[PDB]
Amino acid sequence: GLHRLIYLSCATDGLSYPDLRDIMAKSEVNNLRDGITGMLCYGNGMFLQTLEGDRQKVSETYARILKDPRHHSAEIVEFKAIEERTFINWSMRLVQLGEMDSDTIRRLRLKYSPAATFQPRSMTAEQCFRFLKELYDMS
């Protein structure tokens, strides 16, 4: 069945631009292959990602993701069955908050969180979903 996974993690000190590109390059390729789609949000040293696809494939990808030393302290936010995909457009799209309009992002971060900075650990499943959805719609 079709499912959506949402999880967050902490970028590991030393995360470089080529690291991000490498991650995206591999993600796009593997997801296209596995029928997975989604978005990756990176800001304030934090990662927030959502993956949509088959139950077995999405789980396998997450298990693989947990092995990447480029981040740590991963936390599952949500995993449930869905009737339709929300994040259809990309196999995997990387959105860097630091490159967005300061006002637009601070307002979005406030809208769906109680934090003074991007802190996904302070956000519920629904707030992460709606947060990513707005970023997706902007892309």
Added chain:
Amino acid sequence: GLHRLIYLSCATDGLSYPDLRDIMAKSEVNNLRDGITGMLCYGNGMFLQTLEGDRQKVSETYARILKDPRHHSAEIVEFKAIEERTFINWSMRLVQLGEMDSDTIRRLRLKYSPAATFQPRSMTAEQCFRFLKELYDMS
């Protein structure tokens, strides 16, 4: 009363347009006679069809379809009473995914399924329904 049937099947190897034309020519005659309407979706060697009409007639048409050597491994996706028809316009309309806007089809496939290719067996009733309805609206 008024019912809707949805089922999927695998096209028998060697299938060509003549077969589809024949299927369509007879479907239109029989369906118009039996008060049946619907749409037939063909793509990636798979069949996804829906019929609306009388409980008895729709069931009879299905039994006749199961005897057709042009496809096999049929699977019922759904059968239930409905308040009104969605596939009203045609006694039977053929839609070939390979001949529709490929960009539109790819997004549609991802939207209602977890597969990398058109695979109705990985889709739920509602998914097949919404998928077919969008195709219907495109015609």
Added chain:
Amino acid sequence: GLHRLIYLSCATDGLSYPDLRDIMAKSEVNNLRDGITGMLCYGNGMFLQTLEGDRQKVSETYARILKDPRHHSAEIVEFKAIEERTFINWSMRLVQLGEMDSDTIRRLRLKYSPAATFQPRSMTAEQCFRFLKELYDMS
């Protein structure tokens, strides 16, 4: 309070144009007097009528209609309380399906029934209501 009655009947062989005219003449006058409004659908030798108004008045009108030899085999489709009327503009409007554009009536009839021709007996209460409502809104 306010109620809506829906019933169907079989026109008696030999039903002429002037008979309908006489039925309509009496209907408009009587319903206006009783505060009743509605629509009379005639097609395929079948009658499908809806009456809105007082519980007592609508009941008395139906009883009176049952005495009319111009039709027979009357069948009640539904009778229930309603918050507001739908068929407001006419004390009684006559709608002959043969006076409508073929394809338009074809689609509408298929949309709310599994029949290949107008057959109210094969329609549910809601189907008859929605059918009559579209005919009403069309004008």
Added chain:
Amino acid sequence: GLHRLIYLSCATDGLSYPDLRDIMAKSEVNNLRDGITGMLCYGNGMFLQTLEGDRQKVSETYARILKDPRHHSAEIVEFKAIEERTFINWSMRLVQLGEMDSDTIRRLRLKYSPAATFQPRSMTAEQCFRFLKELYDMSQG
């Protein structure tokens, strides 16, 4: 398919018990033939009956009832499709408010009605149904 009808009417002045006994007699026979069930409530000179069964059959039975001179001023209370019957065990049981506890029926009446006496005309469809159902369940043995 399966539908339920509820209507009310005024009993003709002079209506006696035997005339009511003849009704129930002819009703039980026909309702058994047409696959119709339900019950008839009589009180304060008013009739409140519910019939369950086929759409056409229930409709035809009602058209036949309208010709009966034993009552008049009939009013349909409701007609709708039902998933299952409520008055199953009864083809056509009779119930006279002027029978059981004049205190029980009194409470039941008030519960589903604003009238000081039995007056189905002042009752809604749901009130009529609930009223009849409670009676049904009451007289079961």
Added chain:
Amino acid sequence: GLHRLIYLSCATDGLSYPDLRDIMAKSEVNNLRDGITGMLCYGNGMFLQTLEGDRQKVSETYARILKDPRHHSAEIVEFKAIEERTFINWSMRLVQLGEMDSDTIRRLRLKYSPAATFQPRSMTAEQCFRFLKELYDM
């Protein structure tokens, strides 16, 4: 996923008791093998059956059933996904309305149908389900 199929059919004229037994013998075996359960109702010359199991398996079983000459004029009542099974206890159980308390089935049949006799064609999907469920509970 888990699904439930309900269909009705007309028993072929001349249906014998040994035919019923052959039907049940085959059902039990194949249904156990395919993880399918359900109940077969036979009365007034009509058949009313429900099958629960996988979408593919139940589908194939129906296709097979359609080829059986012991009945005809098959009509699908419903096919939908379900969260849990209702007819568990039997890979396939047969219930003959004729061998039941004439008064019991009389009230059951009336409860979920407008007909004066067992007529599944005049019953809705929900009515067939409830009918079968109560039958299942006896």
Added chain:
Amino acid sequence: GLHRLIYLSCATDGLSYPDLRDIMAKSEVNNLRDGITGMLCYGNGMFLQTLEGDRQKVSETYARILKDPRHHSAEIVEFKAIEERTFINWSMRLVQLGEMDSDTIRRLRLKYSPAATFQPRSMTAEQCFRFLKELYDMSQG
């Protein structure tokens, strides 16, 4: 808290324009003072008014109204707490059906009632509300 009252009454025979002016004159002043807003419908010799505001204030205003000999046979339609007001614009506005589009009112009256003429007594609370709201939305000038 905030509540809405809806009631109906029969205008006294011989209701003149001065009587109407006086009623509206006093209504506007008092309602303004009490923080009450609403609309008064007059047609077919009947009154259908709605008052929104404080529970005690609306209640007292109704009590005074019942003392006005310029109408009678008053009947309460509804009284309940509301989250927000609908009839906000006027402390009290008079809407005379006979001064509006004859066909427009006929259809509006039919839309929310089973009567052949304006008869609020045959209408439910929901019907009276929507009827008034539609009149309110039209009489916005």
Added chain:
Amino acid sequence: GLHRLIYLSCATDGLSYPDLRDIMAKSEVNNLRDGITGMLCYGNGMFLQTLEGDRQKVSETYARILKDPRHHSAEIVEFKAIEERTFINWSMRLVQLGEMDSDTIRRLRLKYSPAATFQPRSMTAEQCFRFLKELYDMS
């Protein structure tokens, strides 16, 4: 149709016991005649009553009550249509909170109000309803 009125009022200073007996005497007779039932609560110099019955009847009885100099500052708590009555047993029953068990009423009072003493003006419609219903049930 069937409706329910709930209102509160201030007993006029000087309210004697014979007044209550007289109020009840007339109430029992009139309500029985008008098909009205309900409960009358008196306490802390305040009245709280509910009347169920016809819309016209209940409205007229309230109008009469408003002319009774034995009380004043009447406030309507609610007036709505109901499918069935709650206070069926009595055409009118009087309950004097001052003659009930201390703790018993203390709890009831607190349960449906923020007041330490009986004050219906501080209670919502639902609160007055449930409060009156429990008194009804205890009797």
Added chain:
Amino acid sequence: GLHRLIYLSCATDGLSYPDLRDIMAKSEVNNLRDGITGMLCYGNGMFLQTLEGDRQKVSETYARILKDPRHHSAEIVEFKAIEERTFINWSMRLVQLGEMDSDTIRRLRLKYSPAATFQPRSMTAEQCFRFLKELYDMSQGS
């Protein structure tokens, strides 16, 4: 998690313009620091404020607010969790009813209250929220 607090209070007699400005300036600073947003409505000698943010932070802010002698007779109107904020744009902006279009305020005040003047104590939590939201929506300028 994310929460919203709404409370009302009476301005202390003698409060002046500079007093109000001092409240807003200090509030914006602290709220910005604590991830809190909201609006302060002032009218008819009454205060109606909403704060959105963290459960701990908003609570502590309210504690501090209670110590401010510039107002008194404070009453909590509501405190609950929320899926998303409504008052996103301002750390804490002051909105004076007396500065807005009299006719606009009057209709807004009547819409969500039974009072003839601005009286937050006569309003429910839902009315206060909707009142503040509309005020906020019509104060986004151009």
Added chain:
Amino acid sequence: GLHRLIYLSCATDGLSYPDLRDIMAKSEVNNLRDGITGMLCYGNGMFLQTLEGDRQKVSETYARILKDPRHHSAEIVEFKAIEERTFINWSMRLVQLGEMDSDTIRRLRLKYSPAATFQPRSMTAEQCFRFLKELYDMSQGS
């Protein structure tokens, strides 16, 4: 109208039994006076309390509680209107988790929170309510 408040706080280091008795003594008197009822829970150095009553009275009681030096770091859990009271029986009642049957409290604390020990800050408003509810429904003397 009738409302319910729920808040948590940290007991000040050194909190003694006499202090709890004093807190309870005054609470009972004041609450009885103010028409307030409620429950007080104390465990693992934390307080979880709920108060039901008038919007104004409950708010003032909370403001008073905030000035109490015997606890600190208060956090409001919820404040909303209610149709009827749940904690009706006592002007105030104290339940000490440290004195309850081990298995009983362990199970209750797990049931409404993700913590291995009592920690109201990790609990939602609903969780706090149901938790207090069960303590309230628990017969005195268990």
Added chain:
Amino acid sequence: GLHRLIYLSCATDGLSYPDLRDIMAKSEVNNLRDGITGMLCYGNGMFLQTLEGDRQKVSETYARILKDPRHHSAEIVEFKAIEERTFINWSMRLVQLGEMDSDTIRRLRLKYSPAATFQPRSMTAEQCFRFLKELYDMS
């Protein structure tokens, strides 16, 4: 906040009784420490486990479980917030379907799955939850 994770996996070939004991020993100690509770079901060579607790702790425990060589092919079934725990009684309880009453498990396995044997991969989140709860209530 309080969350519940449900996941399934395949027991590595050779998994025996002693393996399960060691798993339980460590699970009870670690879960008690992390405030985690739940239940582990083992049957037909498959694992079905649910964990309730903190978002972060539950997530970290799952990451550790994924590194255990005693199983493989892990698939997440569900991860969502919950108002209250269902599997309260144990830090971790093991249930071996093989030691259960053959007919008790057959009935339960059929009730929540379309499989002829225990196959969690063919079950939904609701089915897995209800299946686990019924086992929990009879532990």
